[PDB]
Design an enzyme around this catalytic site. Sequence first.
Site, PDB file in Angstrom:
ATOM      1  N   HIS A  81       0.827  -1.215   0.000  1.00  0.00           N
ATOM      2  CA  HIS A  81       0.000   0.000   0.000  1.00  0.00           C
ATOM      3  C   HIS A  81       0.856   1.257   0.000  1.00  0.00           C
ATOM      4  O   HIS A  81       0.516   2.232  -0.662  1.00  0.00           O
ATOM      5  CB  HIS A  81      -0.933   0.037   1.213  1.00  0.00           C
ATOM      6  CG  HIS A  81      -2.244  -0.648   0.997  1.00  0.00           C
ATOM      7  ND1 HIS A  81      -3.361   0.014   0.540  1.00  0.00           N
ATOM      8  CD2 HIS A  81      -2.624  -1.932   1.199  1.00  0.00           C
ATOM      9  CE1 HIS A  81      -4.371  -0.835   0.460  1.00  0.00           C
ATOM     10  NE2 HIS A  81      -3.949  -2.024   0.850  1.00  0.00           N
ATOM     11  N   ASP A 124      -0.301   6.460  29.304  1.00  0.00           N
ATOM     12  CA  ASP A 124       0.753   6.937  28.423  1.00  0.00           C
ATOM     13  C   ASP A 124       2.092   6.815  29.138  1.00  0.00           C
ATOM     14  O   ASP A 124       2.772   7.813  29.394  1.00  0.00           O
ATOM     15  CB  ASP A 124       0.470   8.386  28.010  1.00  0.00           C
ATOM     16  CG  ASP A 124       1.390   8.882  26.905  1.00  0.00           C
ATOM     17  OD1 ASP A 124       1.434  10.114  26.695  1.00  0.00           O
ATOM     18  OD2 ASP A 124       2.065   8.057  26.248  1.00  0.00           O
ATOM     19  N   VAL A 132      -5.124   3.300   6.864  1.00  0.00           N
ATOM     20  CA  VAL A 132      -6.442   3.052   7.434  1.00  0.00           C
ATOM     21  C   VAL A 132      -7.335   2.334   6.428  1.00  0.00           C
ATOM     22  O   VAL A 132      -7.759   2.923   5.436  1.00  0.00           O
ATOM     23  CB  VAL A 132      -7.122   4.359   7.941  1.00  0.00           C
ATOM     24  CG1 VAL A 132      -6.531   4.790   9.261  1.00  0.00           C
ATOM     25  CG2 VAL A 132      -7.022   5.484   6.919  1.00  0.00           C
ATOM     26  N   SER A 133      -7.598   1.055   6.679  1.00  0.00           N
ATOM     27  CA  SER A 133      -8.524   0.282   5.853  1.00  0.00           C
ATOM     28  C   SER A 133      -9.538  -0.448   6.719  1.00  0.00           C
ATOM     29  O   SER A 133      -9.400  -0.496   7.941  1.00  0.00           O
ATOM     30  CB  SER A 133      -7.774  -0.714   4.964  1.00  0.00           C
ATOM     31  OG  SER A 133      -7.339  -1.833   5.709  1.00  0.00           O
ATOM     32  N   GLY A 134     -10.554  -1.015   6.079  1.00  0.00           N
ATOM     33  CA  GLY A 134     -11.559  -1.803   6.780  1.00  0.00           C
ATOM     34  C   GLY A 134     -10.944  -2.948   7.560  1.00  0.00           C
ATOM     35  O   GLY A 134     -11.468  -3.352   8.599  1.00  0.00           O
ATOM     36  N   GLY A 135      -9.821  -3.455   7.060  1.00  0.00           N
ATOM     37  CA  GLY A 135      -9.149  -4.607   7.652  1.00  0.00           C
ATOM     38  C   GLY A 135      -8.258  -4.248   8.822  1.00  0.00           C
ATOM     39  O   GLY A 135      -8.332  -4.869   9.884  1.00  0.00           O
TER      40      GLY A 135
END
EC number: 2.3.1.234
Lengths: 138, 495
Positions: B99, B412, B117-120
């Site tokens: 990608h 953090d 950033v993908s659905g997966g």
Amino acid sequence: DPMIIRGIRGARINNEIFNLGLKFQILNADVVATKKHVLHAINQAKTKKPIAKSFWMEILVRASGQRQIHEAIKIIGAKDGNVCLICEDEETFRKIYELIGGEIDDSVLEINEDKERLIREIFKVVERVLEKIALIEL
Amino acid sequence: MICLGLEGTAEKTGVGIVTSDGEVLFNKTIMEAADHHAETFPKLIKEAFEVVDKNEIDLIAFSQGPGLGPSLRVTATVARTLSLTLKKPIIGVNHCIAHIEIGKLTTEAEDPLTLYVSGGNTQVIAYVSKKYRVFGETLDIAVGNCLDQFARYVNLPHPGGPYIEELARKGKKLVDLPYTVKGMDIAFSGLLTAAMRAYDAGERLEDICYSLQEYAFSMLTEITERALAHTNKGEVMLVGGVAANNRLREMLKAMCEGQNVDFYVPPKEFCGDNGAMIAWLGLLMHKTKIIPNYRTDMVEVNWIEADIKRDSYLDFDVIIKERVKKGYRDERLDENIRKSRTAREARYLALVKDFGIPAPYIFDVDLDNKRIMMSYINGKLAKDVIEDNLDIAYKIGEIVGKLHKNDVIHNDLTTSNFIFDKDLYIIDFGLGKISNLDEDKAVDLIVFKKAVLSTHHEKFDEIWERFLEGYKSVYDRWEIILELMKDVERRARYV
């Protein structure tokens, strides 16, 4: 020009001092951390959303390290013995100093070896007090 | 010579063939269903050989990288057949990096910090030190997954994405939703349930949609800013399915606009996980089987915030933390968190003293300006001093064990959160409320482990032990949450 902040040994807390035009507050010297403690409370009262409806009675609640007013007097309200008088004009100080008793004594303001058990028993070692006053709004 | 690639990690079946120079010849993609891959591939691979002669192709690439088990081995089957029936080499490529590369190949980018950033999946990757390293990472589910899952709950059509962006554009009220940051990572499944319940509650769908993004993308651009410094890149690229999202594109730009860094997005057809995507990388690598969790950080490459003011208060030199507002994020949310975090940096750096652990004295809290006056302890970050003074790793472990005993959980934990004057004062606590939950405690541990693995991989070993040396000392239920730490770590891709 700073607030006339001086400790007083031998106190005569009576009826009188208050409702006669006392435009100058006084606390209990046994549970005042240092002259800093007050200098903090006065700055905190001076620059935070008024928790008390008069500046002079706010100093009491800020220095108290607690929101409640009636419970604030329970722990830091001026009483017979020793006190930390706050004023503006030298002779406005003299008027109240005349009413109560004892010598001007700045050494009763500071933390003895005695306070650092009792002071932090009722506050839950000298700057920690200021941070209780700092968080008074959370 | 030119090369064909096969894409089949998730739901899209992608066949694609690209040149060694950089032009795509074929690129089509049809949308547990491994049968879908096992039936689509022959069709698409036919339409491919009806566009380019089979003889003239020299290389078979297949996304063996991060993905589903059966989906991968189907792609691996078609790949292994092609390579011997053509007598041309096979090349197993990493899906994530694929990608990034056709991002560079299409956009005028060269060395970008990429938010994939993908659905997966969703994570922040930038090539640092001979390997591609993941910095920001979802701890639970992808932004796509999380967003899509909400749509299906509301019963919106099956590309949910668009319509949630649609309805968002018509919202007026920013609903209160769980903004969640765990150090450098993110969690979404909280925000998902929150929106899921907000919907059942009665709030306007139009509204719920707006804030859902506002919380999702704001916490997305937030970690990207975090990476933007650590990696110090001049460019911010956006690959992945959900790269479409106009709003996310909008705030992502806005953010990079402040630090004057550039922002690219690959032309439409090269964000969706595709054939040509992985086809390029294989031949790029030119110039062995499955691994469902291809830990990107394990590749060989061969193509080589809030400001402080120092001031004196009463009789102390102090600092003041102005939580600078960020323009990229929603005006209602922007100031909403910087108040919210100031109200905890105060409430905690103070409450922390109650169980004997050093932090600066807070002299003033000012939620109106989002500034906080705390004593200036002279900076010597534990981060910088941990090499020669390895002894410092001991107390950091110790003082964390105090917190876990008292149900106080920082979120953090990093070596730059501590300094050295005499003890180890934590000069930060912004985010980190109190939680009884056992899983919480375990999550915070791995957050710091990952933090040391992130910036101190050079001398990590025998110092996560030196951490425990202090942590075992203090907290008694230490083997209790560390055993459960194994359970939550086994949240990898489905071996």
